[PDB]
Amino acid sequence: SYPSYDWFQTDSLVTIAIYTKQKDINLDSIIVDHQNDSFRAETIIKDCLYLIHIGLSHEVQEDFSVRVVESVGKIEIVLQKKENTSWDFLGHPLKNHNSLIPRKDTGLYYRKCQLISKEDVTHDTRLFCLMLPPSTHLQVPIGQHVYLKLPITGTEIVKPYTPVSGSLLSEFKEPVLPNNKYIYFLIKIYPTGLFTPELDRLQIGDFVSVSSPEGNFKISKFQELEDLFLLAAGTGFTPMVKILNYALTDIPSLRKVKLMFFNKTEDDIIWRSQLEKLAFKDKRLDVEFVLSAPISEWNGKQGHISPALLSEFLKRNLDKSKVLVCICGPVPFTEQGVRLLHDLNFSKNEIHSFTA
Numbered sequence: 365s366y367p368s369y370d371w372f373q374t375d376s377l378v379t380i381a382i383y384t385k386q387k388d389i390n391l392d393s394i395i396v397d398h399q400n401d402s403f404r405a406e407t408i409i410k411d412c413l414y415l416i417h418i419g420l421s422h423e424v425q426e427d428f429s430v431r432v433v434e435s436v437g438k439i440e441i442v443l444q445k446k447e448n449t450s451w452d453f454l455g456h457p458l459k460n461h462n463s464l465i466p467r468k469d470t471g472l473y474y475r476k477c478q479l480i481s482k483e484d485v486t487h488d489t490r491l492f493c494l495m496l497p498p499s500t501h502l503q504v505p506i507g508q509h510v511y512l513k514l515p516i517t518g519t520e521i522v523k524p525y526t527p528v529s530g531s532l533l534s535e536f537k538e539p540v541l542p543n544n545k546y547i548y549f550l551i552k553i554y555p556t557g558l559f560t561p562e563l564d565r566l567q568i569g570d571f572v573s574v575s576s577p578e579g580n581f582k583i584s585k586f587q588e589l590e591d592l593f594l595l596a597a598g599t600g601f602t603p604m605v606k607i608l609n610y611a612l613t614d615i616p617s618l619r620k621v622k623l624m625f626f627n628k629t630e631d632d633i634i635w636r637s638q639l640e641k642l643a644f645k646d647k648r649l650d651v652e653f654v655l656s657a658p659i660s661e662w663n664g665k666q667g668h669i670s671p672a673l674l675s676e677f678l679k680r681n682l683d684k685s686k687v688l689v690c691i692c693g694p695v696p697f698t699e700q701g702v703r704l705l706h707d708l709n710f711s712k713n714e715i716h717s718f719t720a
């Protein structure tokens with residue numbers, strides 16, 4: 365029982381219908397890109413990718429709509445004809461049209477997004493806001509990353525970054541939107557790096573190529589969760605941002621979320637003030653800052669991730685609960701951390717480590 369597609373037209377519209385044959389399909393299952401005359405829709409179907417890739421017979425307008433009938437996993441993409449005339453056929457198939465291929469074996473697809481704003485968050489970390497083009501539908505699920513790509517002399521360079529929410533605070537958070545055009549990133553600029561100095565040179569209104577999402581985190585790890593622990597070092601905070609928002613809004617069984625955030629100095633605590641206000645106004649959230657190398661008077665915890673520190677933080681309560689520990693940071697920090705969680709008798713199923 366394989367996926368399939370069809371199409372129909374009215375005087376002014378062209379509709380493409382994708383029949384996934386799947387339950388669980390939603391607007392995160394499909395990415396759509398199109399030009400005036402070319403159309404690409406990739407649909408996530410279990411571990412495979414179903415691709416529609418067609419050069420359209422006539423031109424269509426930039427704005428289009430995408431709708432899912434969730435009972436049967438039917439997706440409809442409605443395009444707008446530039447000229448209200450009848451089409452003789454949909455178009456000429458292009459590379460890999462109507463192909464069903466395992467995701468592992470697929471290549472990254474990119475589209476150009478526009479840099480809209482850039483804000484300093486710490487001395488070396490910015491909040492970037494990119495805007496998808498009107499002719500793209502793309503949602504980045506919780507826990508996943510995308511690759512950014514920039515041209516330099518002779519070539520293009522690529523690095524992955526993990527989209528975040530625009531804020532942790534409800535007054536600045538975006539609402540839940542049928543289709544969000546904006547993607548936010550917290551990105552630390554390394555003066556000796558290759559990619560981030562070039563990203564930091566980009567002017568407002570210039571363009572960056574953004575890949576489709578990647579990553580194995582599955583939101584089902586949150587079903588019925590009661591206690592969530594978050595271990596982050598440095599920019600390993602970024603996957604935690606959307607996880608933290610979800611934890612406080614979309615898990616009715618959640619009793620506690622605890623973040624232990626490791627950094628070098630007070631000035632490296634990304635979003636310190638936002639985390640302090642969030643934690644203070646919601647007793648479900650605890651946040652603890654650990655500094656490896658404070659430069660001012662510091663009453664808080666100090667050091668690196670250790671057997672000692674996780675004993676107190678992850679101390680077992682008297683009652684059994686459904687638990688999840690997410691960890692992200694420098695590779696050795698995460699490898700040490702996961703080794704230490706196994707020593708503390710957490711299962712594979714109770715650990716998620718965000719890595720490449």
Ligand SMILES: Cc1cc2nc3c(=O)[nH]c(=O)nc-3n(C[C@H](O)[C@H](O)[C@H](O)COP(=O)(O)OP(=O)(O)OC[C@H]3O[C@@H](n4cnc5c(N)ncnc54)[C@H](O)[C@@H]3O)c2cc1C
Nearest residue numbers: 523524525526550551552554556557558559560599602720
């Ligand atoms: C899945 C994933 C998600 C990510 N998400 C984010 C995110 O949301 N935000 C974010 O800011 N970053 C994120 N990163 C890190 C990011 O991808 C880049 O690695 C980072 O931006 C540095 O790239 P660069 O070219 O600027 O620096 P690089 O050229 O890679 O190096 C920067 C500097 O760091 C030091 N360095 C580099 N490599 C090593 C090494 N192996 N050992 C010791 N020191 C080293 C050196 O001083 C080097 O000059 C993510 C990485 C992955 C794999």
Ligand SMILES: NC(=O)c1ccc[n+]([C@@H]2O[C@H](COP(=O)([O-])OP(=O)(O)OC[C@H]3O[C@@H](n4cnc5c(N)ncnc54)[C@H](OP(=O)(O)O)[C@@H]3O)[C@@H](O)[C@H]2O)c1
Nearest residue numbers: 597598599600626627628656668693694696697718719720
């Ligand atoms: N999903 C992903 O794969 C993903 C997503 C986002 C970010 N990341 C990764 O997270 C990393 C964060 O980099 P950063 O520059 O922001 O961190 P950083 O500020 O240089 O360091 C953050 C904290 O981690 C500590 N630390 C560093 N290496 C350690 C080790 N081996 N053992 C124990 N503690 C260690 C530091 O201690 P010291 O003071 O001793 O240096 C510091 O307190 C990047 O490598 C990035 O690629 C990965």
